[PDB]
Amino acid sequence: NSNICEVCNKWGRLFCCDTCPRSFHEHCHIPSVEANKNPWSCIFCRIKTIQERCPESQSGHQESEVLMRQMLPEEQLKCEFLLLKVYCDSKSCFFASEPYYNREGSQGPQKPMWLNKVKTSLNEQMYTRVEGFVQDMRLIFHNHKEFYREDKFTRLGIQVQDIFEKNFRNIFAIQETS
């Protein structure tokens, strides 16, 4: 296996996948690495299994249909995976913890949102449809763009949103368009 965490790229106390070479810190994996389970398979492997069991799951879908799906176990897992793909980028650090807003000429958002809040919400089964998870993830980047206005720091929100959206389209097999 790898000797660094797949998510944050640091060494430390690592848990190794039994079915692929990836490794994880306990709370870098989502869900947090499970206490027992020998063998253990990582979220990458669990997602690959879903795909391999239902090859048709990779055919194109409409976003509006995906958003309305109830959060049954496979959709829960897919949203956990999508959240983990965003943490995989180092720029996620800007969006992880609870923000605060005190900038001349701007007012904070009405509904602050951040990655660790979405993580807790998934863990606590607070989302009943894919739509709830996706709306809170998009709200993170929309809040940032609105607050930073013309400051060049706005670009960090575009960047991390692009990682979210590309992974959303991949994981949920959204129909390709121009």
Name which of 82 and 134 has its Cβ closer to Zn ion: 82
Q: Which of residues 46-65 bind Zn ion (CB under 5 A)?
A: 54
Q: Which of 14, 15, 23, 28 binds Zn ion (CB under 5 A)?
A: 28
Under the binding rule (CB under 5 A), the answer on residue 83 touching Zn ion is no
Name which of 13 and 111 has its Cβ closer to Zn ion: 13
Instruction: Evaluate whether 43 touches 81 at the Cβ level (below 8 Å).
Output: yes
Question: Cα-flanking dihedrals φ and ψ of residue 23, to 5°?
Answer: -130, 155
Minimum distance from CB of 9 to Zn ion (Å)? Answer: 7
Q: Which of 4, 8, 16, 50 binds Zn ion (CB under 5 A)?
A: 8
Distance (Å, whole) CA 96 – CA 118: 9
Mutual angle of helices 73-87 and 43-53, in 10-degree steps: 130
Distance (Å, whole) CA 102 – CA 104: 7
In the beta sheet, which residues pair with residue 16? 23
Under the binding rule (CB under 5 A), the answer on residue 93 touching Zn ion is no
Under the binding rule (CB under 5 A), the answer on residue 5 touching Zn ion is yes
Q: Which of 4, 20, 171, 173 binds Zn ion (CB under 5 A)?
A: 20
Q: Which of 14, 15, 23, 25 binds Zn ion (CB under 5 A)?
A: 25
β-bridge pairing 23-25 and 14-16: antiparallel
Name which of 27 and 149 has its Cβ closer to Zn ion: 27
Minimum distance from CB of 164 to Zn ion (Å)? Answer: 19
- Looking at beta carbons, which pairs linking 2-11 to residues 24 or more positions away fall under 8 Å? 6/42, 6/44, 6/88, 7/84, 7/87, 7/88, 8/87, 9/90
Under the binding rule (CB under 5 A), the answer on residue 42 touching Zn ion is yes
Q: Which of 45, 88, 163, 173 binds Zn ion (CB under 5 A)?
A: 45
**Residues composing the chain:** 178
Interface residues with Zn ion (CB under 5 A)? 5, 7-8, 17, 20, 22, 25, 28, 42, 44-45, 54
